[PDB]
Design a protein around this nucleic acid. Structure first.
Ligand SMILES: Nc1ncnc2c1ncn2[C@@H]1C[C@@H](O)[C@@H](COP(=O)(O)OP(=O)(O)[C@@](F)(Cl)P(=O)(O)O)O1
Ligand SMILES: [Cl-]
Ligand SMILES: [Mg+2]
Ligand code: NA
Ligand code: NA
Ligand code: NA
Length: 326
DNA sequence: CCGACTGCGCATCAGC
DNA sequence: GCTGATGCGC
DNA sequence: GTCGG
């Protein structure tokens, strides 16, 4: 990419602040600056030119100047040499091991992949599955495999109840040629904001996908959100496909547009769009857009009949999913 | 200067 | 058990 | 770490 070196550096800084410093706002600030620089359609020549962008301030401008002059950042070179930071950054790459658990594991002398595998009884369920598929979960998914996965999910859901609608969202819906995981939005006319007329709506879909050996593991599962593991079937004498992360979110059918806007993302795009909504006097989540009163209490959900209606309330021109990869 | 920073489901834990 | 806070990942 | 008022 055009400024890949700078955005890589800012992302590494973001990950340091989240994982090691446990400084969530610095993490988000670095991600915001990386995102704004990644969309900028010029090869940046100086930190002063970058500082013109929203989210880039004095400190990041100085780092950009160092990086442009030298190709490196001394701050990051030292972080990369710190064993505790190195150990924590590694451990958090396992799904279910966050900043707190990683630091605690290092305290206890659990610092490597070998240590983790030798101490599975110290891991909770999520962490245990994250360790099992550590290698697979770092592989990306070609869009061609996403289409095969889409075809299984939609057809198996149809077999359970033809009134379900499953929608693959995430980067897939934004048109990307590869995805990190699969995100599935699910609706059923029995589940609305007014009532739940049928139980086990998500459970029945999950069990059917398990029945056919598509879903292989469960990280967490409640009434509306499933997070787990899946795998495409392979052919005779073929190597097996990697196991893949899959999330399924059951959303009330009358709130589909807020749900699909949310599950399409990107995460930064949602963050930016919700921040803008607040400046316009609205709050947006995956269910509703609501006005904010004088006191800041959210009012009643506003009528929504398309994704564009949401954009219209906050006076943004509509952006197709392909243009939401921030 | 400095308060605020997008918004939330599920797992886990502490206190009662 | 409930309720609330925290961790985690979305 | 950045920024709006
Ligand atoms: N912190 C967040 N705040 C608001 N919305 C959020 C947040 N995290 C994830 N979301 C999102 C948006 C959407 O992409 C969805 C999917 O979450 P995701 O982590 O799978 O992101 P993605 O866009 O699908 C991807 F490009 Cl990273 P991937 O294809 O590699 O997986 O839920
Ligand atoms: Cl912070
Ligand atoms: Mg995804
Ligand atoms: Na700026
Ligand atoms: Na992790
Ligand atoms: Na996901």
């Amino acid at each position: 990419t055009l400024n890949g070196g700078i955005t890589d550096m800012l992302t590494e800084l973001a990950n340091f602040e989240k994982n090691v410093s446990q400084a969530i706002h610095k993490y988000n600030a670095y991600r915001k600056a990386a995102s704004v620089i990644a969309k900028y359609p010029h090869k940046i020549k100086s930190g002063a030119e970058a500082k013109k962008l929203p989210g880039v301030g004095t400190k990041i401008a100085e780092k950009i100047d160092e990086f442009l002059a030298t190709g490196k950042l001394r701050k990051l070179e030292k972080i990369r040499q710190d064993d505790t930071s190195s150990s924590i950054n590694f451990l958090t790459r396992v799904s279910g091991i966050g900043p707190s658990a990683a630091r605690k594991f290092v305290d206890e002398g659990i610092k490597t992949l070998e240590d983790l595998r030798k101490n599975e009884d110290k891991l909770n369920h999520h962490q245990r599955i994250g360790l099992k598929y550590f290698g697979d979960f770092e592989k990306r998914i070609p869009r061609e495999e996403m289409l095969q996965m889409q075809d299984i999910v939609l057809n198996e859901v149809k077999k359970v109840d033809s009134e379900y609608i499953a929608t693959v969202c995430g980067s897939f819906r934004r048109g990307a040629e590869s995805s990190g995981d699969m995100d599935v939005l699910l609706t059923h006319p029995s589940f609305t904001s007014e009532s739940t007329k049928q139980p086990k709506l998500l459970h029945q879909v999950v069990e059917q996908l398990q029945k056919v050996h598509f879903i292989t593991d469960t990280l967490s599962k409640g009434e509306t959100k499933f997070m787990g593991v899946c795998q495409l079937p392979s052919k005779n004498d073929e190597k097996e496909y990697p196991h893949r992360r899959i999330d399924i979110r059951l959303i009330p059918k009358d709130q589909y547009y807020c749900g699909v806007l949310y599950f399409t993302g990107s995460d930064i795009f949602n963050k930016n769009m919700r921040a803008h909504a607040l400046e316009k006097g609205f709050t947006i989540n995956e269910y509703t857009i609501r006005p904010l009163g004088v006191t800041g209490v959210a009012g009643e959900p506003l009528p929504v009949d398309s994704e564009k209606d949401i954009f219209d309330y906050i006076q943004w021109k509509y952006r197709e999913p392909k243009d939401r990869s921030e």
